[PDB]
């Protein structure tokens, strides 16, 4: 069975450089090429080069000639691929790939699962987690309501309701890159608008790149006005 | 060097129908294309290799052809399984993908609008979420008023993966402003225009109200 | 065209020994240089593409380097079955065209 | 598995037309296409032209356009070199190889046929 397991999502400045593995099992790993593909937010793929594990032997892409750097340890049946001088435009999901025959082919039968790197200024930060308020004066017989999670660095956030118990008609959506350089979703739920003042619903946000674990409990907005 | 041009950008089958997508070379060099498959969050998985030949593990459904610089992928009958992006490859080049998503009748938005939080104006911002729900097509048009004054430029849209359920579609659009210009103004309000809908619908809030 | 210009008509080495093929592209061909190997009757192997990556079954003795227009083969620990022809070839653009060609003789002799 | 195998040696004289077989097997015939190269006496190694194995459409270099023709049989997996009013500089070696892509530059010739000899007899 084979199998290529790669390195943990990476967050680097521009002008830094990143490393990410790939480590094979289940082959010989000296026996086959192993290229690098990439794969930026909401685009294609695009082809790095390859490394023959076996001679050390390399070959990039002219886009990347001088910036990125392939290597291997057989001792640990490991492949890697530098980039350097990174830029915005390097966030990607970074894959190695491994093709289908012996010899040299274009067909890439095996992948590893990806390796997310988020080239970016911004530092490390924990949501700000505010109430969607319902309404039932709002109603499309059902009620909606949500949390905004706001300003956070860098992906991902995962949101659930009522620790799990609430899964029909959640939504959480895709997070949104903002001029600030911070990431910010919303998580939305519909319920029925008759239960708005027996149930509660709690949003459990956990954004682990900062260990933040955040329940905020979301009720209709309370009205004083005359 | 060679480009892949792939068509169409978007396919919107049902299931059981069949899939015909199509990659065109900007020059032909030979057979030597791959197809592949990829689904979110996922690596890519090879389905065809030599234009024609299916890679092991794929099922029969999966075929592909070519005459010269044309390659056509071809599902003969959908599965659930099957909508996901598309891409074709010759040598290090690749095609740009098309995303084969589930049509199915048209599904009207409900629409909700949140206003910002107490909470969230107290650190200097207002957030002002407007939620469309579980419509299809994915195509609809969110406007942002304030006071009747048309906005731009200042939201953004998100949209769901294609519901594994019911094929449908949620979007949020978040018109984001600070907590001055929020308290310059009164009506906000969320104009929402989609193919479900014989008129569009509007839901607004006047701030500090009930 | 591309020309690739192989200075070294004839060389004579020893068992044991090494030696170096030079080959000077007259355009900068990047890394798309390959070498080829040549014996009396057969036709050229590969030996080297990409510059200094080696084909299948090529021994590890026969190292490649170079990249824009100076190229190099290098032979190390040269056998006897080494007695031939050397071509260098630029594939970075077609037409592919080929060095003029470097005899390499072995005085041990009588092999391959 | 790859094998190119080519026709026997020719003994023409010179007017006369000669067609040279390139018999291929071990892979997808029309994932490469096939390279000819002469090798005459004192010229050294020039690519004549190439073909398209999948299509079938061939290109010939620049001094090897008009007496040289380039066909193909995809069902025979085989490639043809003709060349029309042999001339006495035509007495060469003929060769047919495999061109591959490995990125980043164009096709190289890692597989080639053992050769075709053509001598022009007066
Ligand atoms: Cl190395
Ligand atoms: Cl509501
Ligand atoms: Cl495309
Ligand atoms: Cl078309
Ligand atoms: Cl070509
Ligand atoms: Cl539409
Ligand atoms: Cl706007
Ligand atoms: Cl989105
Ligand atoms: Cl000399
Ligand atoms: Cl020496
Ligand atoms: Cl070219
Ligand atoms: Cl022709
Ligand atoms: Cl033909
Ligand atoms: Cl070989
Ligand atoms: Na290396
Ligand atoms: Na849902
Ligand atoms: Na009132
Ligand atoms: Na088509
Ligand atoms: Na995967
Ligand atoms: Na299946
Ligand atoms: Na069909
Ligand atoms: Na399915
Ligand atoms: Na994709
Ligand atoms: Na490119
Ligand atoms: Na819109
Ligand atoms: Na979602
Ligand atoms: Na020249
Ligand atoms: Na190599
Ligand atoms: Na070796
Ligand atoms: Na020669
Ligand atoms: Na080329």
């Known amino acids: 069975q084979v199998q290529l397991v790669q390195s943990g999502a990476e967050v680097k400045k521009p002008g830094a450089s990143v490393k990410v593995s790939c480590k094979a099992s289940g082959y010989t790993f000296t026996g086959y090429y192993m290229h690098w593909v990439r794969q930026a937010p909401g685009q294609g793929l695009e082809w790095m080069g390859w490394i023959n594990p076996n001679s050390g032997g390399t070959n990039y892409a002219q886009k990347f000639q001088g910036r990125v750097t392939m290597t291997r340890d057989t001792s640990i049946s490991t492949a890697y691929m530098e980039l350097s001088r990174l830029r915005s435009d390097d966030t990607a999901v970074y894959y190695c790939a491994r093709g289908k025959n012996s010899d040299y082919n274009w067909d890439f039968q095996h992948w590893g699962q990806g390796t997310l790197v988020t080239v970016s200024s911004a530092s490390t930060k924990g949501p700000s987690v505010f109430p969607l308020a319902p309404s039932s004066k709002s109603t499309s017989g059902t009620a909606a309501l949500g949390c905004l999670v706001k300003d956070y660095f860098p992906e991902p956030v995962t949101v659930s309701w009522n620790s799990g118990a609430l899964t029909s008609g959640v939504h959480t959506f895709p997070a949104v890159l903002q001029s600030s350089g911070l990431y910010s979703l919303s998580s939305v739920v519909t319920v029925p608008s008759s239960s708005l003042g027996t149930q509660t619903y709690i949003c459990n946000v956990n954004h682990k790149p900062s260990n933040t674990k955040v329940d905020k409990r979301v009720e209709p907005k309370s009205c004083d006005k005359t | 060097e060679i480009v892949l041009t792939q068509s169409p950008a978007t396919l919107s089958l049902s299931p059981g129908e069949r899939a015909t997508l199509s990659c065109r070379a900007s020059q032909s060099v030979s057979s030597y294309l791959a197809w592949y498959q990829q689904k979110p969050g996922q690596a890519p998985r090879l389905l065809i290799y030599d234009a024609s030949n299916r890679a092991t593990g794929i099922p029969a459904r999966f075929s592909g052809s070519g005459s010269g610089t044309d390659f056509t992928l071809t599902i003969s009958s959908l599965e659930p399984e099957d909508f996901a992006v598309y891409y074709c490859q010759q040598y290090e080049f690749f095609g740009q993908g098309t995303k084969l998503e589930i049509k199915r009748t048209v599904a009207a938005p409900s629409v909700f609008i949140f206003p910002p939080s107490d909470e969230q104006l107290k650190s200097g911002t207002a957030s002002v979420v407007c939620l469309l729900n579980n419509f299809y097509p994915r195509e609809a048009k969110v406007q942002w008023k304030v006071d009747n004054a048309l906005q731009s430029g200042n939201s953004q849209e998100s949209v769901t993966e294609q519901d594994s359920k019911d094929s449908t579609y949620s979007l949020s659009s978040t018109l984001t402003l600070s907590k001055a210009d929020y308290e310059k103004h009164k009506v906000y309000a969320c104009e929402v225009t989609h193919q479900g809908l014989s008129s569009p619908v509007t839901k607004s809030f006047n701030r500090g109200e009930c | 065209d591309i020309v690739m210009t192989q200075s070294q008509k004839f060389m004579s080495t020893s068992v044991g020994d090494r030696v170096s093929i030079t080959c000077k592209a007259s355009?900068?061909?990047?890394?798309?240089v390959a070498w080829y190997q040549q014996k009396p009757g057969q036709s050229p192997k590969a030996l080297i593409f990409?510059?200094?990556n080696r084909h299948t079954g090529v021994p590890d003795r026969f190292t490649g380097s170079g990249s824009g227009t100076d190229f190099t083969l290098t032979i190390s620990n040269v056998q006897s079955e080494d007695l031939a022809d050397y071509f260098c070839?630029?594939?970075?653009?077609?037409?592919?065209?080929f060095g003029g060609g470097t005899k390499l003789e072995i005085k041990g002799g009588g092999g391959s | 598995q790859i094998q190119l195998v080519q026709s026997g040696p020719e003994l023409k004289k010179p007017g006369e037309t000669v067609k040279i077989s390139c018999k291929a097997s071990?892979?997808?015939?029309?994932?490469?296409?096939i390279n000819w190269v002469q090798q005459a006496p004192g010229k050294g190694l020039k690519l004549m032209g190439w073909?398209?194995?999948?299509?079938?459409?061939?290109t010939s270099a620049d001094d090897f356009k008009g007496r040289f023709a380039f066909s193909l049989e995809t069902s025979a997996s085989t490639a043809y070199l003709q060349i029309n009013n042999l001339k006495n500089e035509d007495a060469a070696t003929y060769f047919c190889?495999?061109?591959?892509?490995?990125?980043?530059?164009?096709?190289?010739?890692?597989?080639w046929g053992q050769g075709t000899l053509v001598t022009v007899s007066a």
């Open positions: 990409l510059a200094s």
């Open positions: 071990g892979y997808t015939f029309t994932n490469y296409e």
């Open positions: 070839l630029q594939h970075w653009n077609y037409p592919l065209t």
């Open positions: 355009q900068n061909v990047r890394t798309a």
């Open positions: 073909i398209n194995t999948y299509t079938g459409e061939p």
């Open positions: 190889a495999r061109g591959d892509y490995y990125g980043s530059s164009s096709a190289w010739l890692p597989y």
